[PDB]
Amino acid sequence: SHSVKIYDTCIGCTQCVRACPLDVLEMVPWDGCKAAQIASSPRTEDCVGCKRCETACPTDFLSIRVYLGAETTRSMGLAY
Amino acid sequence: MATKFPKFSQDLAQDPTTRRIWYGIATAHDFETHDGMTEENLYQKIFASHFGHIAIIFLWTSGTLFHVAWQGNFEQWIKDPLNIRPIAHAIWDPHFGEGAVNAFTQAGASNPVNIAYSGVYHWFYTIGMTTNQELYSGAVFLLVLASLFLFAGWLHLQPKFRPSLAWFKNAESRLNHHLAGLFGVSSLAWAGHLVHVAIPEARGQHVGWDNFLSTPPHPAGLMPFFTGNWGVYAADPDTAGHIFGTSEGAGTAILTFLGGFHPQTESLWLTDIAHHHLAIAVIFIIAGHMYRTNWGIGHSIKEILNAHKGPLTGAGHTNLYDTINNSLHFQLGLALASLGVITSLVAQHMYSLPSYAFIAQDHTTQAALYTHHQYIAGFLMVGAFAHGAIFFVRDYDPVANKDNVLARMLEHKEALISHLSWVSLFLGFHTLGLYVHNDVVVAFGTPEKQILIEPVFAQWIQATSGKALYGFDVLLSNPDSIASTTGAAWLPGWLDAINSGTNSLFLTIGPGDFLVHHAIALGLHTTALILIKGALDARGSKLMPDKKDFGYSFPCDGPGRGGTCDISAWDAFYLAMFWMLNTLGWLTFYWHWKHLGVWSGNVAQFNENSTYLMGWFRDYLWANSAQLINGYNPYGVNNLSVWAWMFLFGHLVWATGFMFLISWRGYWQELIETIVWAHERTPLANLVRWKDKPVALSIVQARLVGLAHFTVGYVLTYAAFLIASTAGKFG
Amino acid sequence: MDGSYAASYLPWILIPMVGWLFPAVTMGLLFIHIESEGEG
Amino acid sequence: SNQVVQAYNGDPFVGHLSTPISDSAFTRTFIGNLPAYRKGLSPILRGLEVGMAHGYFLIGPWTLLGPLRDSEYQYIGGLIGALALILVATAALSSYGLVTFQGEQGSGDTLQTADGWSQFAAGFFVGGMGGAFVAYFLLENLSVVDGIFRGLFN
Amino acid sequence: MTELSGQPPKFGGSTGGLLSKANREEKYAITWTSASEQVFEMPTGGAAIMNEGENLLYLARKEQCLALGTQLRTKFKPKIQDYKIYRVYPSGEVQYLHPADGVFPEKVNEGREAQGTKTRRIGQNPEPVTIKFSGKAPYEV
Amino acid sequence: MALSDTQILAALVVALLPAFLAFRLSTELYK
Numbered sequence A: 001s002h003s004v005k006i007y008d009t010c011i012g013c014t015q016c017v018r019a020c021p022l023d024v025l026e027m028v029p030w031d032g033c034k035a036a037q038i039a040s041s042p043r044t045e046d047c048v049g050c051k052r053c054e055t056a057c058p059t060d061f062l063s064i065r066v067y068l069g070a071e072t073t074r075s076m077g078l079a080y
Numbered sequence B: 001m002a003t004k005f006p007k008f009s010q011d012l013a014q015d016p017t018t019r020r021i022w023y024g025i026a027t028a029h030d031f032e033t034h035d036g037m038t039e040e041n042l043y044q045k046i047f048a049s050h051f052g053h054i055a056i057i058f059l060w061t062s063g064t065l066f067h068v069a070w071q072g073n074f075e076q077w078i079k080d081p082l083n084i085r086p087i088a089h090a091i092w093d094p095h096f097g098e099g100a101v102n103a104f105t106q107a108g109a110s111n112p113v114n115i116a117y118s119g120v121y122h123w124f125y126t127i128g129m130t131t132n133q134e135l136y137s138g139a140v141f142l143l144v145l146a147s148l149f150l151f152a153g154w155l156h157l158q159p160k161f162r163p164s165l166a167w168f169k170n171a172e173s174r175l176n177h178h179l180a181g182l183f184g185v186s187s188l189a190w191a192g193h194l195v196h197v198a199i200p201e202a203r204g205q206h207v208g209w210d211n212f213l214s215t216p217p218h219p220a221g222l223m224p225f226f227t228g229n230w231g232v233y234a235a236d237p238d239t240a241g242h243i244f245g246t247s248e249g250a251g252t253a254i255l256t257f258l259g260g261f262h263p264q265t266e267s268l269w270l271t272d273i274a275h276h277h278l279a280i281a282v283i284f285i286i287a288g289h290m291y292r293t294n295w296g297i298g299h300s301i302k303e304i305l306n307a308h309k310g311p312l313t314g315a316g317h318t319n320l321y322d323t324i325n326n327s328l329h330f331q332l333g334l335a336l337a338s339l340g341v342i343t344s345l346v347a348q349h350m351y352s353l354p355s356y357a358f359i360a361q362d363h364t365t366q367a368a369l370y371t372h373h374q375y376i377a378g379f380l381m382v383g384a385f386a387h388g389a390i391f392f393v394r395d396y397d398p399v400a401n402k403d404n405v406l407a408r409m410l411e412h413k414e415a416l417i418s419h420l421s422w423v424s425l426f427l428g429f430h431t432l433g434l435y436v437h438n439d440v441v442v443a444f445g446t447p448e449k450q451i452l453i454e455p456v457f458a459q460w461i462q463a464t465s466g467k468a469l470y471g472f473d474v475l476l477s478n479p480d481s482i483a484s485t486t487g488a489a490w491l492p493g494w495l496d497a498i499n500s501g502t503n504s505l506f507l508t509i510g511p512g513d514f515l516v517h518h519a520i521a522l523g524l525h526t527t528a529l530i531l532i533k534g535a536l537d538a539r540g541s542k543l544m545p546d547k548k549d550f551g552y553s554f555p556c557d558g559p560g561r562g563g564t565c566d567i568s569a570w571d572a573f574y575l576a577m578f579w580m581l582n583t584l585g586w587l588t589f590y591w592h593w594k595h596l597g598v599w600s601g602n603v604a605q606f607n608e609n610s611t612y613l614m615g616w617f618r619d620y621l622w623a624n625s626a627q628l629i630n631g632y633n634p635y636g637v638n639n640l641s642v643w644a645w646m647f648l649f650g651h652l653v654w655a656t657g658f659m660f661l662i663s664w665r666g667y668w669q670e671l672i673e674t675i676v677w678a679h680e681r682t683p684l685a686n687l688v689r690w691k692d693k694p695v696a697l698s699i700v701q702a703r704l705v706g707l708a709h710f711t712v713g714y715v716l717t718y719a720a721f722l723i724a725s726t727a728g729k730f731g
Numbered sequence C: 001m002d003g004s005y006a007a008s009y010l011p012w013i014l015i016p017m018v019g020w021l022f023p024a025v026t027m028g029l030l031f032i033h034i035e036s037e038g039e040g
Numbered sequence D: 001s002n003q004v005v006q007a008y009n010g011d012p013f014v015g016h017l018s019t020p021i022s023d024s025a026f027t028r029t030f031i032g033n034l035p036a037y038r039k040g041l042s043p044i045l046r047g048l049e050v051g052m053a054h055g056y057f058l059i060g061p062w063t064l065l066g067p068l069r070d071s072e073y074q075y076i077g078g079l080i081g082a083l084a085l086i087l088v089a090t091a092a093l094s095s096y097g098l099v100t101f102q103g104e105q106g107s108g109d110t111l112q113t114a115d116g117w118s119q120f121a122a123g124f125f126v127g128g129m130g131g132a133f134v135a136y137f138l139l140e141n142l143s144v145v146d147g148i149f150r151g152l153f154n
Numbered sequence E: 001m002t003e004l005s006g007q008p009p010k011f012g013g014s015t016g017g018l019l020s021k022a023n024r025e026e027k028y029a030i031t032w033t034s035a036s037e038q039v040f041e042m043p044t045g046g047a048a049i050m051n052e053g054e055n056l057l058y059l060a061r062k063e064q065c066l067a068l069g070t071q072l073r074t075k076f077k078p079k080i081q082d083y084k085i086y087r088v089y090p091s092g093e094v095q096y097l098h099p100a101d102g103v104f105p106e107k108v109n110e111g112r113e114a115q116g117t118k119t120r121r122i123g124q125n126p127e128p129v130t131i132k133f134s135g136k137a138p139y140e141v
Numbered sequence F: 001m002a003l004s005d006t007q008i009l010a011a012l013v014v015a016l017l018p019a020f021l022a023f024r025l026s027t028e029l030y031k
């Protein structure tokens, strides 16, 4: 399964989760930013690695990072 | 679906798709990323693999010797090496018909046969071998040597005999042994063989295992070497009318320095060759006494590196000893770069200064050797830069190399890459401009309006070595010069060999050579640009500041931040491979067209038509295909049939690679989804199900496989053309 | 296809063994090996 | 643990030893994958493969050393000898199974039953006849095989 | 997870739906309520009709279910936001998946534990040479 | 003189030694 990490430059704009087509990420309470929220990746077993989240990120170089890893039926996006 | 293979990566072995197999093949030799790999186990597995690889080399050489001795015509080809075609091995193919059987029953053989272009007959003959018995004995001995190295590799995987990491990192001792023993003692042994077998056997004196202990290579024994005077070993050198393999005009000398070419064999003098090997043996032995080991005297490489600082270079070479000795990728890059340099050197020297008897007259083998070695050198250079990039990805420590030369190179990488880009643009614009100007000016019927730049620099250089054609009269070309008034024993022979337009020694050059040299400069600079920019941005750029976290090779970083295809340093290697092939194409086209003109006595064709690109297109490529493409015909078949078939085969493989290079993955994965659906819903075929899920090839895999096809087609197409054209004209 | 070289009966059977038997056998062994669902 | 010989299956008191010939990785893998022991196979397939191999190689002895070797019927004689020896071997296999699996049937492996052993005998018979006949047919037609291998018909 | 209820959408069939993976490996379910019988686009191709009331539909992947869910909540005049997505195994086990805690993941909800969070910047990952011959990568340490 | 029938056959027998050693080396490197 791919790895998804969220670093402390997160502004909590929620576009991470809004872009995910597989519900890997969540908005969880935090205190580092004004929005009092941060992105989390509790369900990376369903991640396919399309990179939509990072495409949505505004911070100067991403606060969310997807590193493709061990390929499974789910991560390869297989319907068969 | 638990799946063992590959046992070194659980990530791959858990992949439920066909990818698992492909990647299993593609990552087996990347020991560093195996599950549980240590540094010591890494060095040890690499040691055993080295032993196995050396054994493979010895077995390949055994096969060459054995097939020449079994199915060849070595002994016949010795009788008349200028009119008999040397034989590689026998053909056995049930697909053949009568036409091909008759066409390949050649070179005087009674069965189908291939003509050898490896130059191996000339090599074995100049060595001193003259019978199939000696070749067979050498082949069997190499069988035994390969066995020895296979056993050594096996033995050094056993617990007691596994060398330690400190032993692998003992750089000073290994350098002493490789300079003194591997280089020096071996060169001394080859000087000894030449003096004992090659030189006598060239004079009708059979010297073998059954008499070499009793027949001195010189009438005056070793005492002249032990007492004082060595000029006796220069004695009476072989006269200009020496007939190779006979006593006619033969002498007794063993070490000479008369330079030039043996008049009959048109190659370097055997005595000069043995003397060279002896001298460089002494030098390499002395070199192997520089670094300390177990006796206090000697040098510490760490000290020498830490002692070469600089007022304008910061920390100099400090800590480069550990930087190099801790990175197998740094050392491998050094090795591949130096090896590619010396392979190109081999190529540029063996065609100009051949050392094997009657090989300068074998045009197909000479062309094939030059092309072969230059291609090998190009591959080596690309690999050296690839592994420099891999070093930066995996091994570079910025705090240990802080402010030293490595980090400082990294610190102005923008300037390096930018100026490489500038000189690339310079060369490209202006060389293409001159070529296209010449094309248009000749096309419109005014060939006198071309821009024909005389290559005065290289001509002046040739003049510095005695070449009096251009009339510069500088240094060696000037008899009044102090470089000529030295009394050197090699000057007369060197001048006679360089001032005769019958060899390849410093071939005459004109504007076509100028233009193609600037094309070569463009190709070298562009390939270096791709490789260096990949290496320096391997750890990061403004598009990917964290690229080192992703590894040397990876598909991309997605359509975001503008799009990031071919963003990795592996991708830079892949892109530079095309420019490597292009540069080699220009280089080898150059060599072959010029040597065709030279061998045929018509240098004017190249001199007059190489200045415009239609000249290459028509007089070189288009013309020299006529026999090639006629290897098989509606009217019959001849001995060039195999090369015509291989020519078309190389075209087909090249074009197939284009598919993997242009069409990308998603299109294929969706098509394969339709095909998967069809299989699941077809009765009878239903009974069968796949063990691995079929999926399209991966992004990186597509680049690799497309490049592999492209390169295979490139090499086979050009080899077919080169071989067939040169053997149809002169073979 | 004939052979004046010594032991020219060797290619007669060696060509089918190197071209048919060795490839088929080795591909079968590798197919079985890379599909073995042991442990990992 | 430099010793290459150890107890069999970790039991020093069972009448056997673990040696490079008896219980090594190569022997385990090779013997265990012969048709007799290959995992999952049905008795008739084991028998068929074994019979193929045996009928094939049993052609040779009488072909080259039998009484008809010096006659115009050498290959036919070798064929007949092979077929008859395979018939006697099949009767032997069938009778063995007949007497060894009389009562209750074990559940371990299908080969070690009455039905399974008879199926193995049927497979052996068929494969042995077939292999003997194909060896005889190759020898009888050695000339066309020669022309095929030399490309004489192109 | 008790027992999935809801009528299947009115649909004439297609070749783009479930394959062998559904019975051998895993499949996915999405339920939702509609205020009206109305047309929607199948993620597997073509048009289908959702029933007034509860609806239950089986698809091959989680992504197809979430694509249908976005279509439901962003392409109908009164939105459909009550859809639930489950994973279904051949044993019959049903694993509720989405929305994980009854609240869509785009908005903060108390009780969620941060996963995959790093207390550093991307630029503050360690040098790979410092972690080589380990199993980790700079983002895993 | 040409190569002998026996010299060709003796070559394969000798080559049996590096074959066995290569088998051992390969299987050891698999560990």
Ligand code: CLA
Pocket (backbone or CB within 6 Å): B046, B047, B050, B051, B054, B167, B168, B170, B171, B173, B174, B175, B177, B178, B180, B181, B182, B183, B186
């Ligand atoms: C005098 C002692 C000695 C000698 C004989 C060697 C010899 C060798 N060592 Mg070793 N080594 C030694 C001591 C020695 N070692 C010690 C003390 C250490 C510990 C400090 C090491 C540790 C060490 C390691 C870790 C490794 C080696 C390896 C090797 C092999 C290098 C690969 C090769 O075959 O290229 C042979 C090269 C030449 C013969 C000369 C180089 C080529 C010249 C420069 C250019 C070409 C020559 C000529 C122009 C071309 C001829 C063309 C021809 C066709 C006509 C080599 C045979 C490597 C190996 O392969 O392991 C098996 C390896 O991994 N060594």
Ligand code: CLA
Pocket (backbone or CB within 6 Å): B025, B026, B027, B028, B029, B030, B031, B332, B379, B380, B382, B383, B384, B386, B390, B552, B553, B570, B573, B708, B712
């Ligand atoms: C002695 C020199 C040497 C050494 C030991 C290494 C060692 C290594 N290299 Mg390197 N490299 C070299 C030379 C060398 N390389 C050269 C010359 C090049 C330029 C081509 C490269 C470019 C390079 C790149 C870009 C990469 C490596 C990688 C690697 C590592 C993984 C190897 C692997 O598993 O690949 C697997 C091997 C293969 C897939 C072989 C397939 C190619 C075959 C031989 C060609 C097939 C020809 C085909 C059959 C034609 C038939 C003709 C017929 C039809 C007529 C490994 C540590 C990889 C790595 O791990 O990065 C860290 C990596 O990505 N190397």
Ligand code: CLA
Pocket (backbone or CB within 6 Å): B420, B421, B422, B424, B425, B426, B427, B428, B429, B432, B522, B526, B529, B530, B575, B576, B578, B579
């Ligand atoms: C004939 C094929 C071709 C051509 C012309 C080029 C062109 C170029 N490549 Mg490229 N390349 C090619 C094939 C080709 N490539 C292939 C197959 C690959 C493998 C994928 C690559 C991969 C590659 C890489 C990775 C890189 C290059 C680089 C370069 C530039 C090198 C510098 C130079 O030559 O300056 C001069 C430019 C030229 C000679 C080409 C332009 C010629 C035109 C006629 C100029 C005139 C302008 C024209 C009038 C514009 C008006 C058009 C109007 C009619 C519409 C150059 C622009 C390197 C680079 O960018 O250098 C900085 C670089 O990094 N190439």
Ligand code: CLA
Pocket (backbone or CB within 6 Å): B056, B059, B060, B061, B062, B063, B064, B066, B089, B090, B091, B092, B139, C010, C011, C012, C014, C015, C018, F011, F012, F013, F015
């Ligand atoms: C790498 C060396 C090499 C190569 C490229 C060849 C090439 C060839 N051989 Mg030859 N052979 C070799 C060595 C080699 N030989 C040696 C040393 C011997 C003496 C034992 C022989 C004895 C031999 C016989 C009797 C015959 C051939 C024949 C042939 C041709 C068909 C192959 C075949 O059916 O025979 C199979 C070859 C063998 C049974 C001998 C084993 C080859 C060596 C010892 C092992 C090489 C292993 C290699 C290095 C591993 C590389 C793997 C790599 C891809 C990773 C073919 C062109 C046939 C022929 O005459 O053509 C018309 C033929 O009948 N060879």
Ligand code: CLA
Pocket (backbone or CB within 6 Å): B094, B095, C015, C016, C018, C019, C020, D134, D138, D145, D148, D149
């Ligand atoms: C790898 C080397 C190789 C060799 C040696 C051959 C040789 C041959 N090819 Mg082939 N071919 C090859 C590769 C090769 N091919 C490849 C790579 C391709 C394309 C991908 C082709 C595609 C090709 C086609 C399309 C055709 C051939 C055909 C032929 C055969 C023509 C003669 C014939 O008609 O009898 C046929 C010979 C046999 C079928 C082999 C029989 C050998 C024995 C007698 C079989 C029985 C043995 C016994 C029962 C089992 C042994 C037990 C134990 C001792 C091991 C011939 C034997 C033609 C053909 O098959 O003719 C019918 C044909 O149509 N070739």
Ligand code: CLA
Pocket (backbone or CB within 6 Å): C016, C017, C020, C021, C024, D056, D057, D059, D060, D061, D062, D063, D064, D065, D135, D138, D139, D142
């Ligand atoms: C009393 C002892 C004895 C005697 C005297 C013989 C006598 C004979 N044996 Mg036998 N053998 C014996 C014991 C004996 N064997 C034992 C103990 C074994 C081990 C169990 C074998 C196993 C053996 C095999 C495997 C073969 C023989 C064969 C032969 C015959 C070869 C002579 C010949 O035809 O020359 C000329 C050579 C030939 C006719 C070679 C045939 C061509 C082969 C079949 C090509 C197959 C290769 C190819 C890769 C097949 C794959 C195709 C596939 C892709 C479909 C001969 C009559 C051969 C035979 O029966 O020929 C049909 C043969 O295949 N023997």
Ligand SMILES: CCCCCCCCCCCCCCCC(=O)OC[C@H](CO[C@@H]1O[C@H](CS(=O)(=O)O)[C@@H](O)[C@H](O)[C@H]1O)OC(=O)CCCCCCCCCCCCCCC
Pocket (backbone or CB within 6 Å): B155, B158, B159, B160, B161, D002
């Ligand atoms: C041109 C000629 C060149 C010189 C002549 C060389 C030819 C002679 C080679 C002799 C090989 C004999 C093979 C049979 C014995 C065998 O396999 O033992 C294998 C065992 C390994 O045991 C292993 O031991 C392992 C455990 S431990 O490591 O012992 O703890 C265990 O796991 C494993 O099962 C076991 O096998 O090896 C030994 O223990 C000693 C090997 C003896 C080899 C002598 C070689 C002579 C040196 C000459 C060359 C030196 C050059 C070096 C510098 C360049």
Ligand SMILES: CCCCCCCCCCCCCCCC(=O)OC[C@H](COP(=O)(O)OC[C@@H](O)CO)OC(=O)CCCCCCCCCCCCCCC
Pocket (backbone or CB within 6 Å): B308, B309, B310, B311, B312, B313, B315, B316, B317, B405
């Ligand atoms: C036609 C071929 C030439 C084109 C090559 C590419 C263009 C070169 C333009 C690069 C300018 C470099 C600016 C240096 C920046 C600079 O001034 O660094 C500072 C440095 C002063 O520090 P030091 O000399 O004390 O450092 C040397 C070490 O001891 C300390 O690390 O000056 C030099 O090194 C002068 C040598 C420059 C080396 C030039 C590179 C080309 C060398 C070619 C090979 C020389 C012969 C080698 C024989 C073994």
Ligand SMILES: CC1=C(/C=C/C(C)=C\C=C\C(C)=C/C=C/C=C(C)/C=C/C=C(C)/C=C/C2=C(C)C(=O)CCC2(C)C)C(C)(C)CCC1
Pocket (backbone or CB within 6 Å): B061, B065, B134, B135, B137, B138, B139, B141, B142, B189
């Ligand atoms: C006691 C001893 C001495 C006496 C030594 C005597 C009495 C003989 C010495 C022989 C020596 C020391 C070396 C002989 C080496 C021969 C070698 C090493 C052969 C190497 C061949 C290689 C490597 C491969 C060759 C290839 C083959 C096989 C081919 O057939 C084709 C070409 C090629 C592929 C190259 C003296 C008193 C002097 C000094 C004191 C010690």
Ligand SMILES: CC1=C(/C=C/C(C)=C/C=C/C(C)=C/C=C/C=C(C)/C=C/C=C(C)/C=C/C2=C(C)CCCC2(C)C)C(C)(C)CCC1
Pocket (backbone or CB within 6 Å): B329, B330, B331, B333, B334, B337, B341, B381, B384, B385, B387, B388, B389, B391, B392, B532, B535
């Ligand atoms: C990436 C990288 C890298 C790199 C790599 C490479 C690939 C390199 C190279 C390079 C090269 C490829 C170089 C070249 C060179 C050359 C030279 C350096 C030369 C010399 C010269 C001279 C000086 C000569 C002279 C002379 C003459 C001319 C003639 C007469 C004689 C005399 C001697 C006088 C490394 C790994 C390291 C690190 C990491 C990164």
Ligand SMILES: CC1=C(/C=C/C(C)=C\C=C\C(C)=C\C=C\C=C(C)\C=C\C=C(C)\C=C\C2=C(C)CCCC2(C)C)C(C)(C)CCC1
Pocket (backbone or CB within 6 Å): D052, D053, D054, D056, D057, D126, D127, D129, D130, D131, D133, D134
């Ligand atoms: C090398 C080696 C070895 C050995 C081996 C041997 C000793 C042998 C075998 C051999 C054999 C022993 C073979 C065989 C073959 C057989 C076959 C191939 C068969 C067949 C059959 C067929 C083909 C068919 C037939 C038929 C039928 C059944 C029906 C009708 C009639 C007919 C005829 C059609 C081992 C592995 C141990 C080890 C390693 C090395």
Ligand code: SF4
Pocket (backbone or CB within 6 Å): A009, A010, A011, A012, A013, A014, A015, A016, A017, A038, A039, A053, A056, A057, A058, A059, A062, A063, A064
């Ligand atoms: S991952 Fe980046 S873009 Fe997405 S919510 Fe977090 S900080 Fe915002």
Ligand code: SF4
Pocket (backbone or CB within 6 Å): A004, A019, A020, A021, A022, A023, A024, A025, A046, A047, A048, A049, A050, A051, A052, A053, A054, A066
């Ligand atoms: S890579 Fe794609 S699937 Fe994975 S978290 Fe990002 S948007 Fe979701």
Ligand SMILES: [Ca+2]
Pocket (backbone or CB within 6 Å): B128, B129, B130, B201, B206, B207, B208
């Ligand atoms: Ca001799």
Ligand SMILES: [Ca+2]
Pocket (backbone or CB within 6 Å): D066, D067, D068, D069, D070, D071
């Ligand atoms: Ca009789």
Ligand SMILES: [Ca+2]
Pocket (backbone or CB within 6 Å): D153, D154
């Ligand atoms: Ca025919």
